[PDB]
Amino acid sequence: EDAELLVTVRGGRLRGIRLKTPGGPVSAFLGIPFAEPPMGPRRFLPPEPKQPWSGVVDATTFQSVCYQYVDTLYPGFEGTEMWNPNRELSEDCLYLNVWTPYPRPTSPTPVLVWIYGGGFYSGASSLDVYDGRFLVQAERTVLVSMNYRVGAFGFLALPGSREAPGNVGLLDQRLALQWVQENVAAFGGDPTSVTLFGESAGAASVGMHLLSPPSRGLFHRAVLQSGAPNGPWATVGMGEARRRATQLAHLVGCPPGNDTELVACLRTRPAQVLVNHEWHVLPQESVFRFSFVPVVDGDFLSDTPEALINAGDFHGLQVLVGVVKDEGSYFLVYGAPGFSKDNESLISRAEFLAGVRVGVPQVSDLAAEAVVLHYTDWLHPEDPARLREALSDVVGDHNVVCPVAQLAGRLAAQGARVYAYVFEHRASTLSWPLWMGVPHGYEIEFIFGIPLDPSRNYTAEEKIFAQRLMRYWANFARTGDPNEPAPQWPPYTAGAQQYVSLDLRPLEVRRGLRAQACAFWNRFLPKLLSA
């Protein structure tokens, strides 16, 4: 029997599996339990470390996906099904995965830790696009990814209560990071060189461990793709979190009042029941808003991410951040009037103004008017093509680009070394319509080297392009610098605001992550709402 696939961690013995790659084999240990199953009385509770086991845990297959909604907008469509659960749903879902070179490294290898996105309501470490076999073979790193609770199971909060303190999905992530510190050396990984990287809610999640001291000692570098902890969707206040949690209880037949009896009744309901009602607790119609997200309650986050970002000292931190070219387009088909993947989505002026209230929810009429002013071309006020692109910019700037730009500028101006990118290559295999451009999430398959899979239809230059990106990411993980020692990728600074475009052409350096648009979102609009 292959001794390379047998590992002893602190909890007991594991049996892995060898995987094939166009470049040779890698070792994979999938479905490693890192917590006790958060079932029954453990629902809504912080995770507890997995108790030691006898015998050999079978770590040859992905474990269950945490209970979550399944997208039904375009049934059977590749563009949406690639994000849906590809394993059975269960609350018994707190498992993690380790990929390492074959044979296992004998000297400490830098570790990449992947945190998936999905708006804190969905996601799984087992999706094909997160397959960690190509990056590990090509770049000789250890790759870890974990499952964490999403939706109500991960982020329902009755602030102050002990039965539902909130943020337990983030504590799932932290527990996995502690697991990496204690056990990754058994796989050949270096616990003193851990780089977190995540996308969308995963990137926001990464932002959060940076701003939470108990997590800060568990990693060394960070990569935030198309997400930030200061996004208007990534956190919720204590009052709004309580209201959302109490309405969910009402919608599923639970009282009132008292917090203890409410959580007890919620613990009696099948997981699928909470999933089916979780979306009817949002205060208004919206895109890019999610019911149960991290709560700012003074514990995991002692203050708002913005407050912590502005006050933090980030000397000694290296971060890689970036966005895709069209962050907003993907979200518009989930509620913006007139949008659909199956026509040109050439909306009218009335639909554009309607879409602004959906894309910028819960703001005063004056704030909405301000948005319409900045994103209108008053020489072509009614052109459908520009209106379609304008609303995509509104959603993309408000939710992704400008939060990321704000984060990058504050970190750089306060001690961090920041590298910024814009991913501008539209994959030849992309199934979404052409008007969506380079949509949210479609840089991930290149970061993980999925184009190297010969079973897929990517072009030759797209394979080289994926190899470039894997090299950038792994360089950063190894040294805090993506550059290969062209042209050079310069650091992002608050003044010069330099970033690079990532596509098939060599690196091009540009200035300003939508500087004009983001001055509105990050400088003016906050002052208007507070007055």
Ligand X SMILES: *[C@@H]1O[C@H](CO[C@@H]2O[C@@H](C)[C@@H](O)[C@@H](O)[C@@H]2O)[C@@H](O[C@@H]2O[C@H](CO)[C@@H](O)[C@H](O)[C@H]2NC(C)=O)[C@H](O)[C@H]1NC(C)=O
379 contact, one of a copy of itself, ligand HI6, ligand NAG, none, CB 5-8 Å limit per kind: a copy of itself
Can you read off the two tokens belonging to residue 423?
Answer: 């991913």
Does 343 help bind ligand NAG (rule: CB under 6 A)?
no
Taking CB under 8 A as the criterion, the residue among 497, 499, 502, 507 binding a copy of itself is 497
Indicate the residue among 275 and 390 with the shorter CB distance to ligand HI6: 275
Beta bridge partner(s), residue 320: 223, 419
Does 428 help bind ligand NAG (rule: CB under 6 A)?
no
373 contact, one of ligand NAG, a copy of itself, ligand X, none, CB 5-8 Å limit per kind: a copy of itself
Stretch that binds ligand NAG, among 128-136, 276-284, 450-458, 481-489 (CB under 6 A): 450-458
CB of 512 to a copy of itself, least distance (A): 5
Does 520 help bind a copy of itself (rule: CB under 8 A)?
yes
Q: Are 322 and 420 in contact (CB under 8 A)?
A: yes
Catalytic residue among 306, 327, 389, 424: 327
Does 279 help bind ligand HI6 (rule: CB under 6 A)?
yes
Indicate the residue among 192 and 457 with the shorter CB distance to ligand NAG: 457
434 contact, one of a copy of itself, ligand X, ligand NAG, none, CB 5-8 Å limit per kind: none
Q: Is 200 a catalytic residue?
A: yes
Does 528 help bind a copy of itself (rule: CB under 8 A)?
yes
Q: Are 491 and 417 in contact (CB under 8 A)?
A: yes
Helix%, strand%, coil% for the chain, nearest 5: 40, 15, 45
Indicate the residue among 464 and 529 with the shorter CB distance to a copy of itself: 529
CB of 97 to ligand NAG, least distance (A): 24
Q: Which residue in 149, 177, 158, 178 sits closest to 46, CA to CA? A: 149
* Neighbouring C-beta atoms of residue 240, cutoff 10 Å: 16
Q: Which residue in 267, 271, 45, 40 sits closest to 165, CA to CA? A: 45
Interface size with ligand HI6, residues (CB under 6 A):
11
Under DSSP, is residue 57 helix (H, G, I), strand (E, B) or coil? strand
Stretch that binds ligand NAG, among 146-154, 238-246, 340-348, 452-460 (CB under 6 A): 452-460
69 contact, one of ligand X, ligand HI6, ligand NAG, none, CB 5-8 Å limit per kind: ligand HI6
Taking CB under 6 A as the criterion, the residue among 51, 268, 310, 334 binding ligand HI6 is 334
278 contact, one of a copy of itself, ligand NAG, ligand HI6, none, CB 5-8 Å limit per kind: ligand HI6
Q: Which residues contact 389 (CB under 8 A, 6 or more apart)?
A: none
Indicate the residue among 115 and 395 with the shorter CB distance to ligand X: 395
Does 287 help bind ligand HI6 (rule: CB under 6 A)?
yes
Q: Is 327 a catalytic residue?
A: yes
Query: Is the CA virtual torsion 157, 162, 167, 168 positive or negative?
Result: negative
Beta pairing, strands 142-146 & 95-101: antiparallel
Q: Which residues contact 264 (CB under 8 A, 6 or more apart)?
A: 163
Under DSSP, is residue 500 helix (H, G, I), strand (E, B) or coil? strand
Spatial strand order in the sheet of 498-502: 17-19, 26-33, 95-101, 142-146, 109-115, 189-199, 221-225, 318-324, 417-423, 498-502, 508-511
Question: Within a 13 Å sphere around the CA of 213, how many CA atoms are in the beta-carbon half?
Answer: 6
From the CA atom positions of the chain, what is the Rg in Å? 22
Q: Are 326 and 423 in contact (CB under 8 A)?
A: no
CB of 377 to a copy of itself, least distance (A): 8
Catalytic residue among 122, 126, 200, 226: 200
Catalytic residue among 209, 220, 398, 440: 440
Q: Are 112 and 197 in contact (CB under 8 A)?
A: yes
Binding residues: 83, 119, 130, 199-200, 330, 432, 440
Question: Which residues of this protein are in contact with a copy of itself, per CB under 8 A?
Answer: 364, 366, 369-370, 373, 376-379, 497, 511-512, 515-516, 518-520, 523-524, 527-528, 531
Binding residues for galanthamine: 83, 199-200, 330
Binding residues for huprine W: 119, 200, 432, 440
Residues with a catalytic annotation lie at: 200, 327, 440
